[PDB]
Design a protein around this ligand. Structure first.
Ligand code: AMP
Length: 627
DNA sequence: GCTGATGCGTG
DNA sequence: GTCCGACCACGCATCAGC
C-alpha cells in the first residue's frame, strides 16, 4: 500500500519497508509520499535522509527508475543543454483543472488565487485508471514538452487531464506544482546529489536480489558514519561538477559504483559547466583583509552575459550559458569569429568570457538592456543589430588538457599566449595587477567611466584554482552599490508561504503637476512574516472595486486588488533606473521613459504621512540626476 | 496579421 | 558568516481566437 509509505522512519529497510516489489515499476505515490515527509520536517539533514531512503529502495528493487525519480525530484525534464521546455504555467494548468472537474475557469482561478496553490485546487477537486508510475509520469512530462505549434495547448491539457484522473491521495498536488514550475520541495541539485551518494553508499548498486548489503554503515559510530558519508558525497559532487549530466553519470554509477565513477567521467568540451562565481565585498579594505597577502588581479566587472565557449576537437563550437543552456544559435556572429581569436596550434578549448553589447560605430560598450533585445531564436548573422564584443578572462580547457587545477596565473598566461585580440570583437578583460590601495580605487572609478559595474578581484596563485559551480571567496566583487516614501496603490496575491495573503504591492509616487499617483515599482521584500500577516487585514480593508481616477499605472502589471491610496511606506532601493513600463516622472528626465526603483525593500510604515505628502515625482527625477 | 494572454531565461 | 533553495524583472517567444 503506497499510501502508507514512510521513508522518514528510522531503521528504514530498502526492501521490506518499500511499497513495491523487486523488478516492478516505482509508483508515483511513493515519490509523492516522499515529498510529503520531506516537507513535514524542517531539518535539512532529515530531508536528505528521507530522500536517500527512497533512492535506496529504487536502487535495490527498480534500478531503471532511478533517473526518472531524480529528475522528478529536481523538477527537470532532462539535461539542461537539451533545452526541453514544458510550455506549461498556471494558465494551462488551471484550464486542465477546470476541464477535468467540469468547473468554470474563473471559479478555478478564484480558488487557485485564494488558496495560493494550484496543486491544492487539483487535489481537493478530484474527478478505473491504473496506478501512476514514476517513469510513466516523467514520460508524460516530456510528452507535454514535445508538443509545440498551433493547437498544442489542447494536446498538452489532454495529457495533463489524464494524469489528474489517475491521481490518488497527494499525487495531483505535486504533479500540478511540478507542471507550474514551483515544486517547492526544499531540496535541489545540492541536496538531491547528497541523498544519491548516501543511497549508493548505504545500499550499494549492482547486487543480486535479495541485496545482501542494505546498510553498509551499520557498525560505524555516529562520527565515523558521518565522516564516511561526507567524503562519499564529495566524490559524487566533484565528478558531477565536471560532468553535469545525469544521463551520463547515473548509468556508470550504477555499473561500477561511486568510487570508480571518477575513472569513467572526465571533463571535456561539449558538456556545459556551471561557471565560477564571486562573493560581494563592501570595499577594498575587506578585499585585502580576506586576501591577506595573496597576490590578486583587478578585472573589469562587465555587464553582459556569462558565455562559456566550447571548441570541440574537430571544429565544432558551442556556446553555453551560466545555467548550462545552449546559446549557440543565439550567437552566430561569435561562431564566425572563432577562427580569428585563436592561434593555429589551438585545437580545443573551453573559454570563460563575458558577452557585452558593442556599439561598433562609437567603439563603445552598451548596457545590458541593449543586449537583452538580441533575438534568442535561431538568428542569422546578417540580421544581428546588437553586435557583441567578447571579454575573455579564464581558460578551463586547452588542447586536450584541463586547467581547473592550475592557478589563475597559469590559466591567464595560457589565455594570453594562445588567443589573439581583435578590438570590438574579442579582447582580454581589462586587468590590473597591483597592491596599492590608491591604484585599485582609481581602477574602480575608471571601470565605471568605461560603462562597467565595478571590479572583479581574483587571486593569482594562492587558492587560485578554477572552482566549477561554486561561489568562491577567492573571487570578489567591488560593485558600485535611496530612501523614498511611496503610496501603496495596489496589492498582488501571494504564493508559497504568502498563499492566503498578499505577496506583492504596487507602489507609487506623487506627481505635483497633475496631482496624480504614478506607479514607480513593485514591492515584496523587506517584510517579516509577522508584520505581513498581522497587517494584511489593514490593507485588505482598503480594497477598491475600481482604481481611483488620479492613479496612473500605465504598462505596469494591473494589481489583483486595487487599494485605496492611504498607506505611505518608507522604501529603500539600491539605485534608480529608467523604465519603459512605469509612468513615474515619465517626461522629467527622458522623453518617453519614466523612473523605477531597482531592488526596492520595505523599511517602515509612515502613518504620519498622507498620499499627497509622499515623495514627489520631481524629487524622484532629482535623485536619478544625482546618480 | 493582430492582439492579448501566456511561457521562458538569467543577471 | 556560510550554504542553499526559491524568487524575480524585463526582455523575447509562443499561441488562442478572431
Ligand atoms: P554583479 O554583481 O552584477 O555580477 C557580475 C557578474 O558577471 C560576472 N563577471 C563579469 N565580469 C567578469 C570578469 N571579468 N571575470 C569574471 N566574472 C565576471 C561575475 O562573475 C558575476 O556573475
Amino acid at each position: 500500500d503506497p499510501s502508507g509509505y514512510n521513508p522518514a522512519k528510522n531503521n528504514y529497510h530498502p526492501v521490506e519497508d518499500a511499497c513495491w516489489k523487486p523488478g516492478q515499476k516505482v509508483p508515483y505515490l511513493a515519490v509523492a509520499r516522499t515529498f510529503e515527509k520531506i516537507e513535514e520536517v524542517s531539518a535539512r539533514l532529515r530531508m536528505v535522509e528521507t530522500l536517500s531512503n527512497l533512492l535506496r529502495s529504487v536502487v535495490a528493487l527498480s534500478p531503471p527508475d532511478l533517473l526518472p525519480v531524480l529528475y522528478l525530484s529536481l523538477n527537470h525534464l532532462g539535461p539542461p543543454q537539451q533545452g526541453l521546455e514544458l510550455g506549461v504555467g498556471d494558465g494551462v494548468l488551471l484550464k486542465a483543472v477546470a476541464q477535468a472537474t467540469g468547473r468554470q475557469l474563473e471559479s478555478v482561478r478564484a480558488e487557485a488565487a485564494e488558496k495560493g496553490d494550484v496543486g491544492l485546487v487539483a487535489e481537493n477537486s478530484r474527478s478505473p485508471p491504473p496506478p501512476l508510475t514514476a517513469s510513466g509520469v516523467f514520460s508524460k512530462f516530456r510528452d507535454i514538452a514535445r508538443l509545440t505549434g498551433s493547437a498544442s495547448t489542447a494536446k498538452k491539457i489532454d495529457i495533463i487531464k489524464g494524469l489528474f484522473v489517475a491521481c490518488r491521495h497527494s499525487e495531483a498536488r505535486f504533479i500540478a506544482r511540478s507542471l507550474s514550475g514551483r515544486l517547492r520541495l526544499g531540496l535541489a541539485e545540492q541536496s538531491v546529489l547528497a541523498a544519491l551518494s548516501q543511497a549508493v553508499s548505504l545500499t550499494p548498486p549492482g547486487q543480486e536480489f535479495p541485496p545482501a548489503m542494505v546498510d553498509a554503515g551499520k557498525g560505524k559510530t555516529a562520527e565515523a558514519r558521518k565522516t564516511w558519508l561526507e567524503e562519499q558525497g564529495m566524490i559524487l559532487k566533484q565528478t558531477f561538477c565536471e560532468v553535469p549530466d545525469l544521463d551520463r553519470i547515473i548509468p556508470v554509477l550504477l555499473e561500477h559504483g561511486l568510487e570508480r565513477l571518477p575513472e569513467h567521467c572526465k571533463l571535456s568540451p561539449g558538456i556545459p559547466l556551471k561557471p565560477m562565481l564571486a562573493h560581494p565585498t563592501r570595499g577594498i579594505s575587506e578585499v585585502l583583509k580576506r586576501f591577506e597577502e595573496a597576490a590578486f588581479t583587478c578585472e573589469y566587472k562587465y555587464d553582459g552575459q556569462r558565455a562559456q565557449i566550447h571548441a570541440l576537437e574537430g571544429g565544432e563550437v558551442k556556446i553555453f550559458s551560466r545555467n548550462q543552456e545552449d546559446n549557440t544559435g543565439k550567437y552566430p556572429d561569435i561562431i564566425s569569429r572563432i577562427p580569428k581569436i585563436k592561434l593555429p596550434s589551438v585545437t580545443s578549448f573551453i573559454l570563460d568570457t563575458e558577452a557585452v553589447a558593442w556599439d561598433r560605430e562609437k567603439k563603445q560598450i552598451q548596457p545590458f538592456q541593449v543586449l537583452t533585445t538580441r533575438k534568442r531564436k535561431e538568428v542569422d548573422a546578417s540580421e544581428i543589430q546588437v553586435q557583441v564584443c567578447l571579454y575573455a578572462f579564464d581558460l578551463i580547457y586547452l588542447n586536450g588538457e584541463s586547467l581547473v587545477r592550475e592557478p589563475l596565473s597559469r590559466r591567464r598566461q595560457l589565455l594570453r599566449e594562445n588567443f589573439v585580440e581583435t578590438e570590438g570583437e574579442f579582447v582580454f578583460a581589462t586587468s590590473l595587477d597591483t597592491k596599492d590601495i590608491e591604484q585599485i580605487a582609481e581602477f574602480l572609478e575608471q571601470s565605471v567611466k568605461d560603462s562597467c559595474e565595478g571590479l572583479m578581484v581574483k587571486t593569482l596563485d594562492v587558492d587560485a584554482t578554477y572552482e566549477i559551480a561554486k561561489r568562491s571567496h577567492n573571487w570578489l566583487k567591488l560593485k558600485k552599490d535611496d530612501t523614498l516614501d511611496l503610496v501603496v496603490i495596489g496589492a498582488y496575491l501571494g504564493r508559497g508561504k504568502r498563499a492566503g495573503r498578499y505577496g506583492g504591492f504596487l507602489l507609487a509616487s506623487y506627481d505635483e503637476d497633475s496631482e496624480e499617483l504614478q506607479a514607480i515599482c513593485k514591492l515584496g521584500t523587506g517584510f517579516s512574516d509577522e508584520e505581513l500577516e498581522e497587517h494584511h487585514q489593514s490593507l485588505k480593508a482598503l480594497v477598491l472595486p475600481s482604481p481611483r481616477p488620479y492613479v496612473r499605472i500605465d504598462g505596469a502589471v494591473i494589481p489583483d486588488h486595487w487599494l485605496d491610496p492611504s498607506a505611505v511606506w518608507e522604501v529603500k532601493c539600491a539605485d534608480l533606473s529608467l523604465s519603459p513600463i512605469y509612468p513615474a516622472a515619465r517626461g522629467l528626465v527622458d522623453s518617453d521613459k519614466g523612473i523605477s526603483l531597482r531592488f526596492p525593500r520595505f523599511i517602515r510604515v509612515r502613518e504620519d504621512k498622507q498620499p499627497e505628502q509622499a515623495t514627489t515625482s520631481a524629487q524622484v527625477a532629482c535623485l536619478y540626476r544625482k546618480q
